[PDB]
Symmetry: C3
């Protein structure tokens, strides 16, 4: 193959080829509910809910798997009575205290029979809740990664975060049987060739078993696949055009056309189920190879034949039959008899125009943001600590006085 632009054919993006036939099969077990242990069974009510949620997920995948399997397979006396009085007075101050004690005891038992237990329960409920958040973030994450896999019983690609559960810290380690290039796995990701299919579901453990099949690419020696676009071209005052296949191949010193219908284009090569090459008729064969005298050219008489095509950042066109402008509809672009087409470059003309149609360079837009609302956690609800010191301090202060008077009553009681 050469440079037969002068005849309107443009061969570009040269690329290698690999055949995907061999593969490694690993199985991945998804466990939907973590081993949960809570002594007092606080997170009990919640576990129950999280399971009914899982069932709504698992059960359908089950019924489906079962269907698939189903098909496939009177003076002293005054002082006397004055004592009796004061005495009866002390006896009542007793029953008084005898009641403050009961009152005080009742308070204790309240605090123990109601308040403390409540505080307890509340915490239990809140421990349970804390678990709900946990399970929920799990179900969330679970579904986001293997959600499309758990939804169909057919093969599917696998997200990066799903592959991340196959290797520890080096993606290469995904293949635990062979050794693989950094390069080779990249072609796998960019192509999403790694496929996953759900094989079974255990309704009791709440686990889904997936079968992933990793392709092992076989590289091909000396094979290159190019893309080709043909445009009309002028020679003297006549316009010609050569229709050719979309892709050309090169195996050793042989060339032919490549049918990439079933393949997938990777970064530096195409990964195919099998060699895509096919033979062209001697004419195209010689034309492409160099003997330009053989090109299957046709005189163009219809507006249908394309007179321009886009190639790697820029346009290729027949500027004789198509009006090519440079940076405005007033700057006509010439093309010497020398060639059959002109390669207008965006470096050359920022806005290259073809028959009025303006083709510019990617225009940056205004930056966008996906942002959540700022959350401020207005702390709990505070309670002012109770204060009785002022009262208790007086009780203890009267108390003392009481003692002093008794002290005095005794030294006065001294009359020997």
């Amino acid at each position: 193959i050469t440079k037969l632009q002068h005849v309107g054919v443009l061969v570009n993006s040269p690329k290698g080829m690999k055949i995907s036939q061999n593969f490694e099969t690993r199985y991945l077990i998804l466990s939907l509910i973590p081993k949960i242990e809570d002594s007092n069974s606080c997170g009990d009510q919640q576990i129950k809910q999280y399971k009914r949620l899982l069932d709504r997920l698992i059960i359908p995948l089950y019924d489906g798997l079962r269907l698939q399997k189903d098909v496939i397979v009177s003076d002293i006396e005054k002082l006397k009575e004055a004592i009796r009085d004061t005495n009866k007075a002390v006896q009542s101050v007793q029953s008084s205290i005898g009641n403050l004690i009961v009152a005080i005891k009742s308070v204790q038992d309240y605090v123990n029979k109601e308040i403390v237990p409540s505080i307890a329960r509340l915490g239990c409920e809140a421990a349970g809740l804390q678990l709900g958040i946990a399970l929920t973030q799990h179900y969330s994450e679970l579904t986001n990664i293997f959600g499309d896999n758990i939804g169909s019983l057919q093969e599917k690609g696998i997200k990066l975060q799903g592959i991340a559960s196959l290797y520890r810290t080096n993606i290469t380690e995904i293949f635990t049987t062979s050794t693989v290039d950094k390069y080779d796995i990249y072609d796998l990701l960019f192509t999403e060739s790694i496929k996953v299919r759900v094989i079974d579901v255990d309704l009791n453990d709440y686990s889904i078993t997936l079968q992933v099949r990793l392709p092992l690419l076989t590289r091909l020696l000396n094979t290159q696949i190019y893309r080709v676009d043909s445009i009309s071209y002028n020679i003297q005052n006549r316009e010609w055009y050569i229709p050719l296949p979309s892709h050309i191949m090169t195996k050793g010193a042989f060339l032919g056309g490549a049918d990439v219908k079933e393949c997938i284009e990777a970064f530096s090569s195409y990964i195919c189920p099998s060699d895509p090459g096919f033979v062209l008729n001697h004419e195209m064969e010689s034309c492409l190879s160099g003997n330009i005298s053989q090109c299957p050219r046709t005189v163009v008489k219809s507006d249908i034949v394309p007179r321009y095509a886009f190639v790697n950042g820029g346009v290729v066109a027949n500027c004789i039959t198509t009006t090519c402008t440079c940076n405005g509809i007033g700057n006509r672009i010439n093309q010497p008899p020398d060639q059959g087409v002109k390669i207008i470059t965006h470096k050359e003309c920022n806005t290259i125009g073809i028959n009025g149609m303006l083709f510019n360079t990617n225009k940056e837009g205004t930056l966008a943001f996906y942002t959540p609302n700022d959350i401020t956690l207005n702390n709990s609800v505070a309670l002012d600590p109770i204060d009785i010191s002022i009262e208790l301090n007086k009780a203890k202060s009267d108390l003392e006085e009481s003692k002093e008077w008794i002290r005095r009553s005794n030294q006065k009681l001294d009359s020997i």
Copy 2:
């Protein structure tokens, strides 16, 4: 430029549609922040933030590693005898009785102080903590939701190096009110952006991940469609037809193109059918051969027809809901095996409408109309909240009342005590 006389020759050209080329793009960055600024001086949600960040790490890291791999490949006292000693003693005893009572008070004004301490040093901070753990939970839910929402909208993009389309809710952050503000660079039709949505032509690739601030950076590529002036595209199906007792069929491309006054075929292969038009990277058209072109333009006597001898050649086709068959070499039964629909040896084919015959018949096969089935629902089970009932308050009044009730009765007696003591 195409005569629909072609119909009489079993060749049907479906609906007309325009064509647009996609070569002008509008790059535009979208920054995803997976964690909001959080304010809580008491650090009551520290444990959740931790939990949340770890959740994001599991999600983000793989995207990160993948981008790195790509970036790499690419680039006792005496006793009382006399009654005055008996009084001295009698009162000396009561003093001790009082001294006992005051001993009892000391014990109570300790029992109370202990309560004022149990409550203050334990019942309170304990309750305070519940609210603090509860604030954490509040933030968890929220944070959990932001994740669930984020993963839904961008989870398809976040999980691949390959380019993907944006969901409606994704695009939602590219405009404030009109879905048009989508493009900032240019001005675009309601029609032009509808073809974009309907086709999922708007695509985005993840560019960089920032593991520290927990943010992903997407590049949205909005394409700008160039409408190809006076170009239409039709889909074309061909059936067999009878003309003078001979049965013919014409093999024709799937699609045809109309450019000005020229015509040919359309290789829509690498293109995408939208609503108003097809959207292709380049012009799909190619040139048919003299015979075929002429045939389609009108010179019906040029059609590369063939005699049907096999049963492979289609004798009917669905187009415009209804059916179009060759009712001569086929038996078209209108509304039930009974009534047969006839076709003069003159015409080419018969166009049967589901309006005339509710259930078209073609040799046993009954092509009917969409039949509506039973309305179905996806509804969550009704929820009801049973806020814990309040706690019957504490009542120690009956006890406090008798308590004060006596304190008076006591004061009384001391009056009488002081009374008799005053008449001495």
Copy 3:
């Protein structure tokens, strides 16, 4: 059709054919917010929040549909009393204390009643709220998984198993409710995700989404069979030939032709086309494919581009005359009588078939892998040892009982005056 392996054409996997034109429309109603019954409005905020979340999800779908419809349409007796007055003043001071105590006590009570009890209930409320949020959050999560792909585009999309889950109750057959469908037919519908659902209408007030499920009804063509065919360069005598043929072939009754399965979708037991994909081949080829092998449009090969080997049913078919086929190692070459056109290499005959050094092995199995969540263990609530003052309280009655006795004593020493 036959056994044309002798000329290098390999007719693979034989499948039947069904066309899909008869559809069964069925509407599905998505309710994003369930009916909530909260008497004391404990979950108010949490609900206002969830809705704010459903809006950031619904709205866009709305704005989207709008754009669409918008476009589509100084003695002893004197001494004795100075001492009793003293005693009384001491009893007075006691009463004063008992008062400051009776006060302090009610105060305690009031606090627990006017500040703690309430505080306990509020906390109880906040939880009921938080519990609702868990629910709502989950619902949102579950629902965005099932229909989130549909809700995000306005083009038709397939439907997940768990999505189909709400069309039937027990048998997956009750999916269609206007006809009766083979278990076989729905499996082809599932295996193909032919069932499509398109978002029809959204309601911003009741937070609901209406979806239309399009359920295809397959019609089966008789005696029709579609085969996949591969062609490889063969070797007859010392000359090397190649016969190029279409990728798919069809068999109808006693006739055969090609098949343009392009617009078609291969299922399990058959292909599901929007219409019969058969076309006729030129006499020569038609004849060739039916036995008359002297009619095969064979071409002499002179390039390495012509396929000399092909993958088939977990094995390889190759021209081991123009290709160097090795069985179980590069030293063991496989031969071929100048007669047969090609050799059918089986992985059972060759664990590792090698074509020109390129190795095609059996499939090895890597290590089982696990996606498991860290073990969660709940450290119970926060427990408070109960309050205990029964010690200090007993030291109270006891002292009163001592006091009671000191009085009983003081009385009798008086009961003996005279």
